[PDB]
């Protein structure tokens, strides 16, 4: 059967000068039943990744409008296509951008999550060029809606290929929805960038450039892995203070440095003999911080892990060439290199330990008694409340906005 | 080649007066002169140079690369020679040892050395000052006013001179492992050959059955081909615009060649490389050895997402001293490292490279790079520092000859 539900439609890219009102609306959509190995999923909540706002601005979607937004969220399996294996109706799942076939040479390497068989669905469509999402326009015509990539989370019901899904309910039966939501992107990204990609060991020094939800997740990982030194860099004093409270040892307000002192110079001055850090994480989306993160790393030895995204002129980023040749080591990172079968189960177990749960609670501003987050909007309460919430994503103390989609 | 009563040697060296900026000539800045080489101090080696050989970075140095204030200088970082004398604190070297001394030493005690996975030593890093730590230089000359003037190094030393002084922490010896290795082979082991060979062997960690792409088959890239063939790569794809050097790469084990200037409309070099791989997945290892900023991005893009490493060896004078990467490709599995001297650590890795260099197939490859004639000990492109500046200027222009892979500068009798 076809489900009618609420979803957040993006009519067109919000280009500079345009408002959220110009492009973002809560509408009724039609969600087709799942086919093949798909899950149709009753969404509990989505949470707002900075990449969700980039999507609203047209990021990676030159033609793929109108769409339903969102890649960060959690929900419950309502129904499955006839070929689906290893899932049941009622399982709680997240479905990030990359699957894990376990047989391709990338999977078999043991050192990456960039699966050759279950890669990013850049088409924002089913492989036959159709979509499980449609709506009736004010002209009465049935119109296609694009996904974000393989799915959209800013909807009461989504459909996703089960080769991208991983279940929460067996390991973490009591995990609240907003915590499941941040495990699907922001928290897996920051935690994994430190744990898996930079491979932080006890006694290592770490620099994190940008302490939004991703960078704070990285601080939580660095503290858990017993980093000797955790340096955070941002312009936002509220989030720097939150980073310090959750384990960071030194903070730098990049907008308060002297004009002649770069962020990388300030970071290196905190390290013995100005040698730099064992691990350098960028989690800002500021193209300048991608270059500064590369420079703050110990030449050759240290890895710089780039998680940041933004809308860059010619879709290009830059590095200072001499500092790059003489020991730069830079990797692109998607979802913290957290492989959905090999790594995610272990991350889920770790997320339930009390200090890690306390860190996720602080990111979210979660109240256990009411199951409310500090910044939360409900899709059932109208487009104006949503437009205000999306503006308030820029509020100094908004770390993670949660979009409630159904009763918990 | 004999010191005066104060231990000072007078010899020939190639002086760079100032940066050769765009539109300037070799004649504007390059001159063979008589210099005074002071005796070695502390742990220094004073080295009778046999030959230097011309790395593209030597030409970038003529053009002002990494030397905003460090003129006049003696050029050169690629060469080999014999210890003539040592500072009083020197350990583990003897007068008569044959040495090379690249940009990075190996202290074996810093956290970078102890990692086992890099040559960027914290204690013996690149000497960017082009001077002694006290602001002096072992090199001077008497100018036309009769005044004694300082000459900068390249970095920790200069090779375009009959006599060089270098901190012994940067040196590694050839004569115990490879007593019969000829000078020009020793010279390319000091930079070009270590860089291309080590980029493949150590940094990209190429395995039997791996696919490899090499962007730029000058001496460094052809050294990478030799390593990739030795390591039994399944596929070795070379990219360049120089037909002569692409053909040489094919003769030394490349499987596929791509002329970047002859690509069909709307096919990038990364797309051309990917089209030669199963399901257009790209290569297990991507080596950039061109100095072309475009190829640094194309190399990144040709790599299998996440799994493969892109090793950047290239150097150049870039707008705003920066290079660029396509962000979407970079985020979704880009993996790029800067490489100096092939990550070949002078104590831990250089000895095995040197043993490898004496194996018949590897020696044949070095001979082809050099166009070496064992009968005459002459290379195809060779100029002698004792034969005057005009011959040197002609040789520098001829670096651009399509069949010049490695110009050698003879410095002394062998
Ligand atoms: N690679 C992935 O899988 C992945 C996953 C999550 C998010 N992202 C990207 O990673 C980044 C972090 O995600 P997020 O949701 O935490 O983002 P966010 O926007 O909530 O947080 C970014 C932080 O960086 C700081 N920052 C940004 N520009 C700055 C500047 N000019 N000077 C100083 N500080 C600056 C901000 O003040 C903020 O605290 C974003 O670019 C996002 O698009 C990617
Ligand atoms: N990282 C290190 O330790 C190290 C050591 C050696 C040299 N280098 C640098 O590595 C690079 C290779 O050194 P080399 O001595 O072999 O240089 P080279 O100039 O002899 O060879 C470079 C090759 O790349 C090709 N190339 C350059 N620009 C091109 C373009 N626009 N289109 C197509 N092909 C192009 C050339 O045709 C040539 O065959 C140079 O940039 C050099 O400065 C660095
Ligand atoms: Mg499908
Ligand atoms: Mg000295
Ligand atoms: Zn995200
Ligand atoms: Zn796979
Ligand atoms: Zn060189
Ligand atoms: Zn060291």
């Amino acid at each position: 059967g076809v489900i009618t539900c609420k979803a957040i439609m993006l009519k067109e890219a919000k280009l500079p000068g345009m408002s959220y009102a110009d492009t973002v609306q809560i509408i009724d959509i039609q969600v087709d039943p799942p086919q093949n190995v798909e899950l149709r999923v009753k969404m509990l909540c989505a949470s707002v990744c900075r990449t969700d706002i980039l999507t609203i601005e047209g990021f990676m979607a030159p033609t793929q409008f109108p769409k339903i937004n969102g890649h960060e969220g959690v929900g419950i399996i309502e129904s499955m296509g006839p070929d689906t294996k290893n899932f049941k109706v009622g399982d709680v799942i997240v479905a990030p951008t990359l699957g894990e076939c376990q047989t391709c040479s990338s999977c078999r390497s043991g050192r990456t999550n960039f699966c050759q068989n279950y890669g990013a669905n850049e088409s924002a469509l089913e492989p036959d060029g159709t979509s499980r999402f449609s709506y009736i326009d004010s002209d009465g015509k049935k119109k296609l809606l694009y996904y974000k990539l393989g799915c959209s989370t800013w909807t009461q019901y989504m459909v996703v290929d089960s080769n991208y899904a991983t279940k929460l309910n067996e390991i973490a039966p009591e995990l609240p929805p907003p915590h499941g939501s941040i495990l699907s992107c922001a928290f897996a990204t920051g935690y994994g960038a430190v744990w898996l990609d930079a491979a932080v060991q006890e006694g290592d020094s770490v620099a994190i450039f940008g302490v939004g939800s991703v960078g704070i997740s990285a601080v939580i990982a660095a503290k858990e892995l017993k980093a000797k030194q955790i340096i955070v860099v941002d312009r936002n004093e509220y989030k720097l203070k939150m980073a310090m409270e959750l384990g960071a040892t030194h903070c730098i307000n990049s907008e308060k440095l002297p004009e002649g002192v770069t962020p990388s110079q300030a970071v290196r001055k905190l390290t013995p003999k100005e040698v730099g850090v064992d691990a350098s994480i960028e989690s800002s989306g500021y193209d300048v911080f991608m270059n500064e993160a590369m420079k703050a790393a110990i030449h050759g030895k240290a890895k710089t892990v780039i998680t940041g995204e933004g809308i860059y002129e010619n879709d290009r980023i830059f590095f200072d060439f001499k500092d790059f040749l003489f020991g730069g080591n830079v990797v692109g990172n998607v979802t913290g290199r957290v492989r959905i079968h090999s790594d995610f189960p272990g991350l889920l177990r770790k997320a339930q330990e009390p200090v890690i749960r306390a860190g996720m609670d602080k990111i979210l501003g979660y109240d256990a008694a009411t199951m409310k987050c500090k910044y939360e909007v409900d899709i059932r309460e109208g487009t104006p409340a949503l437009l205000k919430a999306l503006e308030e994503v820029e509020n100094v103390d908004c770390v993670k906005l949660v979009i409630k989609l159904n009763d918990y």
Side-chain angles (χ1 to χ4, degrees), chain A:
Chain A
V2 174
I3 286 167
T4 298
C5 69
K6 290 178 173 69
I8 297 165
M9 168 180 69
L10 307 183
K11 298 170 179 178
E12 68 172 326
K14 181 184 166 283
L15 302 182
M18 292 169 74
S19 63
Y20 291 118
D22 289 341
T23 73
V24 175
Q25 196 183 348
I26 304 171
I27 64 149
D28 297 328
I29 72 164
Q30 277 69 55
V31 186
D32 261 342
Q35 297 174 30
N36 56 83
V37 300
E38 290 163 7
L39 313 183
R40 187 159 72 174
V41 181
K42 180 175 182 178
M43 297 301 293
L44 291 166
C45 69
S47 48
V48 182
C49 180
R50 173 61 55 185
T51 300
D52 290 322
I53 312 300
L54 297 181
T55 305
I56 296 175
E57 299 166 19
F59 182 66
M60 287 181 61
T63 58
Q64 296 83 358
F65 291 89
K67 74 157 71 283
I68 304 313
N69 200 22
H71 61 277
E72 185 173 290
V74 63
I76 296 172
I77 298 185
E78 165 268 349
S79 66
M80 304 176 287
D83 303 325
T84 307
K85 306 298 185 63
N86 309 125
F87 293 96
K88 289 179 202 77
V89 168
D91 289 348
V92 180
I93 69 88
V94 297
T97 295
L98 309 167
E100 186 194 356
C101 78
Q102 299 190 272
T103 67
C104 72
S105 66
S106 295
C107 286
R108 280 171 63 76
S109 78
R111 58 173 186 270
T112 191
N113 63 330
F114 290 99
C115 182
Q116 292 158 214
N117 292 138
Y118 302 125
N121 190 65
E122 290 172 19
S123 67
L125 290 173
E126 296 297 332
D128 70 349
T130 69
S131 178
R132 299 283 176 271
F133 294 155
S134 67
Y135 70 112
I136 309 299
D137 62 16
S138 66
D139 228 353
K141 309 173 150 198
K142 193 175 138 165
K143 295 322 295 301
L144 174 149
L145 287 157
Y146 286 91
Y147 304 149
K148 168 48 188 184
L149 298 168
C151 68
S152 305
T153 61
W154 292 12
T155 177
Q156 293 190 296
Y157 285 88
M158 108 184 142
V159 176
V160 67
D161 190 298
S162 62
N163 290 290
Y164 292 82
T166 197
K167 84 182 67 178
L168 279 54
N169 47 292
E170 294 181 307
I171 290 168
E174 297 178 9
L175 192 73
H179 308 66
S181 190
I182 62 169
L183 275 155
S184 79
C185 185
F187 184 86
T189 299
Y191 199 101
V194 169
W195 167 47
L196 303 174
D197 217 348
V200 162
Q201 314 297 116
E202 182 171 353
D204 282 350
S205 58
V206 187
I208 298 155
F209 289 81
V211 282
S213 63
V214 177
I216 299 173
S217 299
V219 167
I220 291 165
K223 169 55 157 208
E224 170 63 25
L225 294 163
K226 307 199 177 93
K228 66 175 173 185
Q229 186 188 46
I230 307 169
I231 304 162
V232 294
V233 185
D234 206 295
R235 57 186 173 191
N236 183 322
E237 291 265 346
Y238 179 88
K239 295 179 183 175
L240 287 166
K241 175 156 185 276
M242 183 182 281
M244 295 297 286
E245 281 165 9
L246 293 182
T249 60
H250 305 75
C251 53
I252 298 159
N253 189 326
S254 55
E255 282 303 300
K256 286 188 189 167
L257 289 169
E259 209 54 42
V261 180
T262 65
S264 60
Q265 284 172 329
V267 169
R268 297 175 73 97
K269 285 288 189 193
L270 304 180
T271 68
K273 308 288 186 180
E274 320 189 359
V275 77
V277 293
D278 294 300
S280 188
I281 314 297
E282 184 282 329
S283 42
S284 71
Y286 181 34
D287 59 357
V288 166
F289 278 9
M290 294 169 182
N291 185 50
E292 295 301 317
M294 179 272 292
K295 286 156 68 189
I298 295 175
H299 304 141
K301 177 190 184 288
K303 190 174 281 178
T304 304
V305 177
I306 307 307
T307 70
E309 290 171 287
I311 291 160
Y312 304 121
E313 212 55 37
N314 307 123
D315 187 51
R316 277 182 178 173
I317 61 171
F318 63 84
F319 293 99
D320 292 335
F321 169 68
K322 198 258 290 185
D323 291 330
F324 178 82
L325 199 278
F326 282 86
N329 173 11
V330 188
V331 301
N333 177 288
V334 169
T335 327
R337 224 185 80 186
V338 177
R339 293 164 300 167
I340 55 168
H341 309 308
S342 298
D343 303 322
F344 185 85
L347 180 65
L348 184 51
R349 288 198 178 82
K350 184 56 64 178
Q352 304 204 289
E353 293 181 24
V355 172
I356 311 308
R357 168 57 182 270
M360 298 176 81
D361 281 351
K362 180 96 77 133
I363 289 170
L364 288 164
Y366 184 67
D367 185 326
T370 65
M371 304 191 74
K372 285 272 175 308
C373 296
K374 178 177 271 173
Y375 280 95
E376 185 171 311
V377 66
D378 186 320
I379 198 168
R380 303 166 291 182
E381 296 305 339
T383 295
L386 171 69
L387 297 184
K388 191 171 78 94
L390 289 177
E391 295 278 7
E392 288 183 352
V393 160
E394 311 311 329
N395 281 8
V396 66
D397 65 336
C398 190
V399 184
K400 180 63 61 172
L401 170 63
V402 172
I403 298 170
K404 194 165 173 168
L405 297 165
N406 280 295
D407 297 345
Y408 295 164

